[PDB]
């Protein structure tokens, strides 16, 4: 691989790292990141296929409050890089897809670590605000942006100087009990994401609706859309009945 290709893939990884936290231009989405990585290396169509497949997989990965998303950015960069420097243009896609999912969790851990690390940054920003320095706050904000960019710029450059079957080998040389524990713990994480919401909105007036929803969910013949429609109807009836005696 040419050195210019290495420079461009590192720059694309940095851009994906920045847009993982910015989440505005969507340079961190697989549909863009994979084709950007494959365009600067010659593996254009294969990376387009990989990006399309991963985007089809990662259609619902969104950050909501403190519940961070599986961070499709690191998967998009790293799976595409491993596909590029491993041959097997089109036939190697199922391996990149297979290795992307645990690397998404790894990127989630990394971005959680960096968001935790961002707290002293805003503390220094407050301390500089008390001093009346308007430019150092901007400097610290840009440093925070660059930290999240580096968060992905580093692993993508590390992958470039190791054999292709290194992430896959590490994943395969992993004890089965660890894999099963991770799988079990991954189904209980979403509960935390629910708890944050429940803490936001929970009053003595709406808890009975929570009880009714929990009871109703045990009926397997009712779909999720049916449960949502029942909730909408109940809320509408409650609102209609509340303002019939008040006014």
């Amino acid at each position: 691989m040419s050195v210019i290709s290495i420079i461009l893939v590192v720059l694309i990884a940095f851009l994906a790292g920045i847009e993982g936290i910015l989440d505005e231009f969507q340079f961190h989405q697989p549909l863009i990141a994979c084709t950007l990585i494959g365009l600067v290396t010659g593996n254009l169509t294969a990376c387009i296929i990989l990006g399309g497949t991963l985007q089809m997989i990662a259609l619902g990965w969104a950050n909501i409050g403190a519940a961070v998303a599986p961070d499709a950015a690191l998967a998009s960069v790293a799976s595409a890089i491993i596909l590029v420097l491993g041959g097997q243009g089109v036939a190697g896609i199922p391996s990149a897809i297979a290795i992307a999912i645990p690397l998404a969790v790894a990127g989630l851990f990394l971005t959680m670590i960096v968001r935790t690390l961002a707290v002293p940054i805003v503390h220094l920003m407050d301390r500089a605000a008390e001093k009346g320095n308007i430019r150092s706050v901007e400097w610290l904000h840009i440093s925070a942006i660059c930290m999240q960019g580096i968060r992905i710029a580093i692993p993508a450059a590390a992958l470039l100087f190791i054999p292709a079957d290194s992430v896959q080998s590490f994943l395969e040389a992993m004890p089965a009990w660890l894999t099963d524990g991770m799988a079990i713990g991954g189904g209980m994480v979403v509960a935390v994401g629910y708890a944050l919401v429940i803490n936001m909105m929970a009053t003595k007036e709406v808890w009975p609706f929570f009880v009714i929803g929990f009871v109703v969910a045990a009926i397997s013949q009712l779909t999720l859309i049916a449960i949502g429609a029942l909730g909408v109807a109940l809320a509408l009836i409650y609102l209609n009945l509340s303002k019939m005696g008040g006014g």
Partner: protein
């Protein structure tokens, strides 16, 4: 075992990846309905 499932109707078999669009559309519609009913707080679930 060689036919895995990755959610949203993606299979990615041992040789190729294919998407069945009925399941993908069902997953998209269900996720959108849950997001609109919960304000986008339904979480990440493999549909």
């Amino acid at each position: 075992p060689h036919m895995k499932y990755y959610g949203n109707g993606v299979t990615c078999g041992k040789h190729s990846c294919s998407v069945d669009w009925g399941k993908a559309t069902t997953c998209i519609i269900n996720n959108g309905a849950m997001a609109w009913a919960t304000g986008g707080h339904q979480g990440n679930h493999k549909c």
